[PDB]
Design a binder for this molecule. Structure first.
Ligand SMILES: *CCC1=C(C)C(=O)N/C1=C\c1[nH]c(/C=C2\N=C(C[C@H]3NC(=O)C([C@H](*)C)=C3C)C(C)=C2CCC(=O)O)c(CCC(=O)O)c1C
Ligand SMILES: *CCC1=C(C)C(=O)N/C1=C\c1[nH]c(/C=C2\N=C(C[C@H]3NC(=O)C([C@H](*)C)=C3C)C(C)=C2CCC(=O)O)c(CCC(=O)O)c1C
Ligand SMILES: *[C@@H](C)[C@H]1/C(=C/c2[nH]c(/C=C3N=C(/C=C4\NC(=O)C(CC)=C4C)C(C)=C\3CCC(=O)O)c(CCC(=O)O)c2C)NC(=O)[C@@H]1C
Ligand SMILES: *[C@@H](C)[C@H]1/C(=C/c2[nH]c(/C=C3N=C(/C=C4\NC(=O)C(CC)=C4C)C(C)=C\3CCC(=O)O)c(CCC(=O)O)c2C)NC(=O)[C@@H]1C
Ligand SMILES: *[C@@H](C)[C@H]1/C(=C/c2[nH]c(/C=C3N=C(/C=C4\NC(=O)C(CC)=C4C)C(C)=C\3CCC(=O)O)c(CCC(=O)O)c2C)NC(=O)[C@@H]1C
Ligand SMILES: *[C@@H](C)[C@H]1/C(=C/c2[nH]c(/C=C3N=C(/C=C4\NC(=O)C(CC)=C4C)C(C)=C\3CCC(=O)O)c(CCC(=O)O)c2C)NC(=O)[C@@H]1C
Ligand SMILES: *[C@H](C)[C@H]1/C(=C/c2[nH]c(/C=C3N=C(/C=C4\NC(=O)C(CC)=C4C)C(C)=C\3CCC(=O)O)c(CCC(=O)O)c2C)NC(=O)[C@@H]1C
Ligand SMILES: CCC1=C(C)/C(=C/C2=NC(=C\c3[nH]c(/C=C4\NC(=O)[C@H](C)[C@H]4CC)c(C)c3CCC(=O)O)/C(CCC(=O)O)=C2C)NC1=O
Lengths: 174, 63, 171, 62
């Protein structure tokens, strides 16, 4: 059901409830916890992206100076867009339990795209690293300001899995 | 090779088991055995956000 | 704007060029006023969340069982109303008067809330926090989120916005 | 008062840096005011379950 809407890429939604949802959660591992882990990402998407791009810049203000990777509103906006694109492909990898769509539709050829535009790899890797850390805290419900109410228990396998998807991004950025 | 359309999978998680109901709560999928629960996925273009771009430029030095 | 406010159907009015020059000519501090409005509306989600959160943290009886904002349903209605009010205040600052705020948002609101049992002290405090937050954003004195504008003094616009919040509080 | 849950959504546009999109042309004349526009529309303010849940879980954290 999800593969079809990814492949059509036409904006129409797939809705999974009922028996289909019961089956989905038995097919993936840790199914109910996985729903919560996904929500921990997507419900915080704007927070994750803003904080990561902001941290990339605060650690290297050369990025916002003339000739810098995010100088001008145009380039900052493209960078915030990309961070959200990446985050959302990570979120879908966590929903589906694999990275195939992330690797094929988002990452394949991305280093060369960035190289030829001079999108700086160190800043990019750092934005990804900050998103990775932020997502880890949200999945584990250990963020300092925003909390998620869920049944108590352990989500460290899911947190590790999400971290591995970020590592695939890092290894694609080079 | 990667896509070039700026589209990404937008995943939404719905848990309405507390009972609060809106128009969208009914009719989007069968709910058998999973009352109040739904996963939605669609592919959407990620649009530029001028307000956020301007905010980051002005604010990034404040944690 | 009066046409789109009265039709209330979602069709937008777009004011540029000579129409925008005229808009600014007939209000005080026209360019600064645009920036002051942006300082509110571009932060609307921040302002509303922080104000309702502060209303509750200072008075958790509001989120006790059967309290004013207990249950997601009631919390969501309260966040909605805080945004409604904030947006009518923002439009008052754009247009330079409170007529639409008073007529479309506030007239009869006291009785509406009293009959629903929506607490007056909680409402007052949410409004007071939004008032303070807006004042900082207009003056660009917030701790985290900043607005880049030409340097100067927006005290008059800040006081005008505060007066619109005072009209809400009175109601 | 109205009872439609609608409020005036004011948007301020300042595109004087030259970054434009499809929406940047055709909505109004720009004579004498390049890159500048005020947009107002009446929109229903919708309930936000994610924010409601967040506030209930997080309000004690400034
Ligand atoms: C939306 C922001 C947010 C809320 C709300 C919340 O409860 N947690 C939030 C974010 C969050 N951030 C991190 C980790 C980092 N964030 C940054 C960027 C900021 N640090 C700066 O120095 C800076 C410029 C001055 C920033 C902007 C950085 C660098 C990190 C650390 C990354 C790392 O290498 O570990 C987290 C994870 C840690 C935590 O739970 O606090 C979270 C949840
Ligand atoms: C989006 C939030 C925000 C950012 C980002 C930023 O840079 N400034 C922001 C908000 C902001 N808040 C205030 C003022 C108040 N906020 C509260 C609520 C919080 N206080 C609590 O005790 C609490 C629960 C633990 C909260 C949540 C309160 C009470 C105030 C003060 C209201 C008053 O009576 O004066 C401001 C304005 C003050 C400032 O500039 O820091 C801003 C910008
Ligand atoms: C790590 C992510 C955090 C954590 C998670 C956790 N969740 C559960 C149990 C449940 N979670 C759900 C949630 C959903 N199921 C759905 O179908 C949907 C909509 C798509 C959602 C949001 C459900 C239904 C359960 C089952 C129990 C219940 O109904 O309340 C657990 C318990 C263990 C388990 O495997 O069931 C845990 C640990 N908890 C944490 O503390 C981490 C921060
Ligand atoms: C560059 C990529 C930057 C960016 C731009 C951006 N703008 C919009 C939307 C609008 N821009 C205007 C401004 C005008 N329209 C006009 O006709 C005039 C002349 C009078 C101006 C100054 C308007 C009104 C809109 C809204 C359009 C509408 O109501 O339908 C967008 C959103 C997408 C779109 O094209 O509508 C974007 C992305 N955003 C950035 O982040 C970059 C910094
Ligand atoms: C308090 C609000 C803050 C502050 C404001 C400030 N702004 C200006 C000058 C200008 N602001 C604009 C902005 C717009 N005009 C429009 O029509 C629109 C779109 C609807 C916008 C966003 C403009 C055009 C100017 C004129 C200067 C310029 O050409 O850029 C000033 C300078 C004084 C003046 O009245 O012009 C000030 C002080 N400044 C602050 O420091 C406060 C935090
Ligand atoms: C009560 C006012 C609470 C609240 C509810 C609210 N929900 C939505 C949107 C959706 N809810 C669902 C959930 C389902 N649809 C189904 O058919 C099923 C059974 C299988 C479920 C569990 C969905 C799918 C949506 C989105 C619909 C879509 O994609 O078009 C809203 C938004 C408005 C609407 O009615 O669509 C709201 C307001 N929100 C709150 O804040 C209260 C706590
Ligand atoms: C939040 C600070 C406080 C709070 C709010 C709350 N309000 C309601 C119910 C209503 N609010 C309105 C307000 C408007 N409707 C409009 O159309 C407009 C202008 C366009 C406004 C200002 C109305 C009409 C209602 C009743 C109808 C409705 O539900 O929408 C509630 C729900 C109360 C209930 O128990 O049903 C709540 C929770 N509550 C608090 O405790 C805070 C102090
Ligand atoms: C759906 C999958 C998909 C992806 C992944 C994607 C990425 C992508 N990012 C691009 C640009 C860009 N990406 C950035 C991002 C950044 N700059 C920085 O300095 C930071 C390190 C980083 C943010 C963290 C920037 C600034 C550009 C514009 C580069 C330029 O114009 O010079 C481009 C070139 C075309 C364009 O500008 O839109 C592509 C194709 N496009 C897609 O369709």
């Amino acid at each position: 059901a999800f593969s079809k809407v990814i492949t059509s890429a036409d904006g129409k939604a797939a809705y999974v409830g009922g028996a289909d949802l019961q089956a989905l959660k038995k097919f993936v591992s840790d199914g109910n916890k996985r729903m919560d882990a996904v929500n921990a990402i997507v419900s915080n998407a704007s927070c994750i992206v803003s904080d990561a791009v902001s941290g990339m810049v605060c650690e290297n203000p050369s990025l916002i100076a003339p000739n810098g990777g995010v100088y001008s509103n145009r380039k900052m906006a493209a960078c915030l867009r990309d961070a959200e694109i990446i985050l959302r492909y990570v979120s879908y990898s966590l929903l589906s339990g694999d990275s195939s769509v992330l690797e094929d539709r988002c990452l394949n050829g991305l280093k060369e795209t960035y190289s030829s535009l001079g999108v700086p790899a160190a800043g990019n890797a750092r934005a990804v690293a900050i998103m990775k850390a932020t997502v880890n805290s949200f999945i584990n419900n250990t963020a300092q300001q925003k909390k998620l109410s869920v049944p108590s228990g352990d989500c460290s396998a899911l947190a590790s899995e999400a971290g591995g998807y970020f590592d695939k991004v890092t290894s694609a950025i080079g | 090779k990667m896509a070039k359309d700026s589209k990404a999978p937008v995943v939404e998680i719905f848990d309405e088991r507390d009972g609060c109901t809106s128009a969208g709560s009914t009719g989007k999928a069968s709910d058998a055995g999973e009352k109040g629960l739904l996963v939605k996925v669609s592919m959407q273009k990620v649009g530029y956000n001028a307000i956020m771009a301007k905010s980051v430029a002005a604010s990034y030095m404040n944690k």
